[PDB]
Amino acid sequence: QSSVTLFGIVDTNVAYVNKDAAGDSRYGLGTSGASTSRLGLRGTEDLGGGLKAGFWLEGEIFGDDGNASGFNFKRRSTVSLSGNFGEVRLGRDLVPTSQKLTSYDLFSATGIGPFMGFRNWAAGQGADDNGIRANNLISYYTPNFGGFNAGFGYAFDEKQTIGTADSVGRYIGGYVAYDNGPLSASLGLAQQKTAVGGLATDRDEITLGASYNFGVAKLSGLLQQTKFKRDIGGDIKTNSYMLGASAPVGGVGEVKLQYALYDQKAIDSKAHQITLGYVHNLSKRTALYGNLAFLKNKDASTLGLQAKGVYAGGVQAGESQTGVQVGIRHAF
Amino acid sequence: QSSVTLFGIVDTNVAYVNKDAAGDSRYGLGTSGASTSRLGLRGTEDLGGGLKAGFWLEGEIFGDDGNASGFNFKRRSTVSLSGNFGEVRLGRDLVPTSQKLTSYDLFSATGIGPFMGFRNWAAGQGADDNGIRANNLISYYTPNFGGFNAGFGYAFDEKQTIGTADSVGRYIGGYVAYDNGPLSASLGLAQQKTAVGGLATDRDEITLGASYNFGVAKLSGLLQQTKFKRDIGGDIKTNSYMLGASAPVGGVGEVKLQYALYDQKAIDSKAHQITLGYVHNLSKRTALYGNLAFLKNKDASTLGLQAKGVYAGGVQAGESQTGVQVGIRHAF
Amino acid sequence: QSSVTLFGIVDTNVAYVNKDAAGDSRYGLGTSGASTSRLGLRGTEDLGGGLKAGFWLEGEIFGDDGNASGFNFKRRSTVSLSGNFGEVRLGRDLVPTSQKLTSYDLFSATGIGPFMGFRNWAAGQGADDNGIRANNLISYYTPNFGGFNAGFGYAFDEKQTIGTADSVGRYIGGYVAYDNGPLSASLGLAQQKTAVGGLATDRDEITLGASYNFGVAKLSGLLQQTKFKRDIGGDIKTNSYMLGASAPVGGVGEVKLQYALYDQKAIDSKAHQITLGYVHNLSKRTALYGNLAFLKNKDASTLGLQAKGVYAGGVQAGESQTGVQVGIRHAF
Amino acid sequence: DNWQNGTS
Amino acid sequence: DNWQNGTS
Amino acid sequence: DNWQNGTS
Ligand SMILES: [Ca+2]
Ligand SMILES: [Ca+2]
Ligand SMILES: [Ca+2]
């Protein structure tokens, strides 16, 4: 039928990382360790005949400083029309490839140690070169057909020009997946137009994901290759691998263990990441959680843990980093 | 009685203009082609005895980029007290003259081709030199007396000083109208204090409007003269004329045709504007729409179509411009 | 039980001060003369067994310019867990010392003439050197024990460094109070780490407050000593004294008279402040109010009245200042 | 009072 | 849960 | 329509 919803999530924590780019430890009050804090309004209007209209406005919440930088709806601001033909969405939102593929990340793309494949590896100059969201986006999601489902999206560059790139921000991509019972598998392909050092560059991304729920435990993995290739030659390639396992502890408790490997070709360096986490649910809305992550940078790698609100910068080349995150996540 | 309302409108579209100030065509995802996207909260408290207190907070929504520049309540942020004496309003809001007179614009002052008389013709340095809204505003609206109704407003300059102008932003104005059945006619007069090139200037605006609903069609027109006159002499005058016709197409469909002529004296140039639009309502809340506009700049005129979110800048002198806007408007 | 609330307050007024730092009078539309305008969302989830989870997001409203600078949740953005052990709060909020002690200010820390002890007397370089709120805050409030109640808080500096100060923003403090029937007394102690002129400085603050409700009238007072002491020597000390009386006028009317004395040691100067106010309630939600304040600066003192939205800057040394504030406050 | 939408 | 106003 | 919370 028709309804309007005002909702959100406040997830704040105490965090700690043993070293920053200067070698000092850092600790304080951070946010979004289990789920990204947010505030949004959404609705669905039944137009009759299986046809529905909907809107969704969502922005991130920063409980540690009261959204000092302001509140906005950068997470999602869409209007849509859906029916048996599927669903068409207009407005900023996660692009189809990331919306579907981040579902295989047991840490939900947030907190100190989620899957970091979706990032701006080449220091591109586009606004969303981490391949997660896009402005001026138009999406189409098919209905489900015996497990099979797909999504396609296109984002207008609107002639944003940087250096020799005159179509910065353009996105073209989609995915094909099979979701049925305990099995889920997806293949996503996408290309964005951007600029690196003022030179036209294509950001090509292929991602394969799958997970299997065995009941007593769940297995999940991600395979991704992100290649920034400049028109004039020279490219930055990075392959990311991830395998994780999740298990319920009975009394609304959950344990998670995820391993990630980032093979950064451009600098011939690797980084190993291990995240262990526990989620204790006091209710369907409120949970207590703990995240323990370790990151080992090889050679020239300088990746760092994402302790949002405390420290999410890089570290000195070849340095290892350990981080802790303990907090409360409340949904409403 | 007493109630509180959380409401809004998400209107996003795909837009196209055949040429910008550089001569290139521009297309992408834009917003507010049929109605300005917004989010607001309002309420009315019955104080007993016909006396009521109310509040209204409203800000614009930009679905294409998720309010990247932030969310605010610049559309309206008022607190009011009303009774049989009429209504008194305090806070930023549309000034009485524009609130009443833009009602004759068949395109509701939004989209690629609305009535453009309310704009900063002299490149004034005041924040609201387009004569639409005002900060520090106090308004008074009378009750209706056999069709007759009026509104008056005053906005404090609070000594905002620019160059020789020490009362920038001050507004004084109001309107007198007759609204009964199919007839509506209004006369508005207003003056704002501003500065042009750092020199004290008065922005004088007189606007006459009227419309008649013949049932099978509706006729509407606007006559306006905006004159920016500097204290030290020299003024920028522009006369705007508009005539439009609207007609229902039966099945909750509507066709609109509006013509506008802008006589820019300061540069002895004219601009002709023709807007054709169709609104198809799937429901009282959701509609599909299309806007087709053509703008012909004469001589030195450089006005351009307002494709919000794609391109709303000017064009090369004497150039003609054509624009298209197709989208979905959803109210909640 | 469990509930979610969307609320706020719109308080806008017409204000006037006879002189600014230039000696000119200033008048216009201002805000928050009786209560700070705000918009917030809060909720409480009953977890069973006396255990509750809650969230609170609140930001200030500026009705005169429609939150031109943007909307945020800088007033309070917390998530909490409470039970018979008391309550633990995480996120930006009033620090325990100011939350409790400002309750003795008959003018609720807002408007032209509230108690001004909570301010940045030394021109410290910390974000919240007025000792009112704090980022990265963790608070603990005890339950009430036969009148006795206390609160403690800690705010992480997160290594914010300015000059020789490498822990700017850190807060440590709390209070002990007795609240029963017509009697209320509190003692608060707090220390913040900051920097003045780029030099590490401790902001030490001790505050004693008490009030007695005699029914026909209420007596309230505040005693405070704020000392900014630099590590390398030299300190800025100021003692603030306040005594006020409030009385109901029967028909939901209230008269308030408050006197304040600010002894600014650093500049060996004093300032006397007298505020008289009247609050007329049309209902539990809507009120009409008037504030009349006089401020007498002695010698080098340059304090000024806080007519938010019109003028809240200082005045010329030794100058006296008179201010008026008349408006409407509507809660929802 | 419960918050209602633009219409009802 | 339905959203309520400051009072009720 | 009355505004509901994330769940109900
Ligand atoms: Ca923080
Ligand atoms: Ca756009
Ligand atoms: Ca003002």
CA distance B93 to A266: 55
Residues by chain with Cβ below 5 Å of ion ligand 2: A 136; B 28-29, 64, 309
Contact B61 A43 (CB under 8 A): no
Count of other CB atoms within 10 angstroms of residue C163: 14
Chain D residues whose beta carbon lies within 8 Å of the beta carbon of residue A6: 3
Q: B77–C68: do the CB atoms touch at under 8 Å? A: no
SS (H, E, C) C63-114: CCCCCCCCCCCCCEEEEEEEECCEEEEECCEECHHHHHHHHHCCCCCCCCCC
Burial-class residue C268 by CB neighbours within 10 Å (0-12, 13-18, 19+). Answer: exposed
Is the Cβ–Cβ distance between C320 and C295 less than 8 Å? yes
- How close, in Å, is residue D7 to chain F by CA atoms? 7
- Measured from the Cβ of residue B42, the count of other Cβ atoms closer than 10 Å reads 18
- Ligand 2 center to A138 CA (angstroms): 11
Task: Write out the residues of chain E at the interface with chain B, using a CB-CB cutoff of 8 A.
Answer: 3, 5
Q: What is the CA radius of gyration of chain A?
A: 20
Q: Cα C209–C212–C215 angle (5° rounding)?
A: 155
A37 token code pair: 């804090």
- Residue C289 CA to residue C256 CA, distance in Å, equals 11
Residue D3, chain F, CB below 8 Å: the answer is: yes
Residue ranges of the alpha helices (H) in chain A? 96-101
Method used to obtain the model: X-ray
Long-range CB pairs of B262-266 (<8 Å, 24+ gap) are: B262/B116, B262/B117, B262/B238, B262/B301, B262/B303, B263/B238, B263/B239, B264/B121, B264/B238, B264/B301, B265/B236, B265/B237, B265/B238, B265/B239, B266/B121, B266/B122, B266/B235, B266/B236, B266/B237, B266/B238
Q: Tell me the CB-side half-sphere exposure of residue B112, using CA atoms within 13 A.
A: 32
Which domains are delineated in chain B?
Answer: 2-332 (2.40.160.10)
State whether residue C265 is helix, strand or coil. helix
Which resolution in angstroms does this entry have? Answer: 2.1
For A266, phi and psi rounded to 5 degrees? Answer: -45, -35
What's the number of CA atoms in the CB half-sphere (13 Å) around residue C74?
A: 15
Residues of F near A (Cβ–Cβ under 8 Å) read 1-7
Q: Is A281 exposed, middle or buried (0-12, 13-18, 19+ CB in 10 A)?
A: middle
Residue type, B51: L
Are A69 and C85 a contacting pair, CB within 8 Å?
no
**C-alpha torsion angle, residues A224, A225, A228, A232 (rounded to 10):** -160
Separation of C57 CA from ligand 2 center, angstroms?
30
Residues of C in contact with F3 (CB under 8 A): 6
DSSP state of A63: T
Within 10 Å of residue C231's Cβ, how many Cβ atoms?
12
∠ Cα A186 A188 A194 (to 5°): 160
| φ, ψ (nearest 5 deg) of residue B57 | -125, 120
Structure-block tokens of residue C227? 């000392």
Phi, psi of A117 (to 5 degrees): -60, -35
Task: Summarize chain F as % helix, strand, coil (round to 5).
Answer: 0, 25, 75
Q: What is the DSSP pairing of strand B137-141 with strand B133-134? A: unpaired
Which residue in D has a C-alpha nearest to residue B8's C-alpha? D6
Which chain B residue shows the shortest CA-CA distance from D2?
B4
- Phi then psi dihedrals of residue A104, to 5 deg: -90, -5
A43 to D3: CB separation less than 8 angstroms, yes or no: no
Whether residue B175 contacts residue B209, with contact meaning beta carbons closer than 8 Å, is answered with no
Encoded tokens for B279: 């609104």
* Rg of chain D over all Cα atoms, to the nearest angstrom: 6
**CA gap C140, C132 in Å, rounded:** 17
**Burial (CB count <10 Å: 0-12, 13-18, 19+), residue B216:** exposed
Neighboring chain A residues of F4 at a CB cutoff of 8 Å: 3-6
The Cα B154–Cα B171 span in angstroms is 5
Distance from CA of B260 to the nearest CA of D (A): 32
Kindly identify which residue of chain D lies nearest to residue F5, measuring between CA atoms: D3
Which three-class secondary structure state does DSSP give residue A104?
A: helix
**Which helix H or strand E contains B101, and what residues bound it?**
helix B96-101
Distances, alpha carbon B326 to alpha carbons B19, B291, B292, in Å: 18, 6, 9
Q: Which helix (H) or strand (E) holds B273?
A: strand B269-281
CA neighbor of B95 nearest in space, from B153, B167, B157: B153
Pairing of strands B199-213, C183-196: unpaired
Measured between CA atoms, the residue of chain C closest to residue F8 is C3
CA neighbours closer than 13 Å in the CB half-sphere of residue A332:
31
DSSP letters spanning B195-256: EETTEEEEEEEEEEEEEEE-SS-EEEEEEEEEEEEETTS-EEEEEEEEEEEEEE-SSSEEEE
Q: How far is CA C221 from CA C34, C114, C175, in A?
A: 19, 12, 16
> How many residues are listed for chain D in this entry?
8
Contact yes or no for E3 and F3 at CB 8 A:
yes
Q: How far is CA B227 from the centre of its chain?
A: 18
End-to-end CA distance of chain B: 21
Of the candidates B275, B285, B253, the residue with the CA atom closest to the CA atom of residue B10: B285
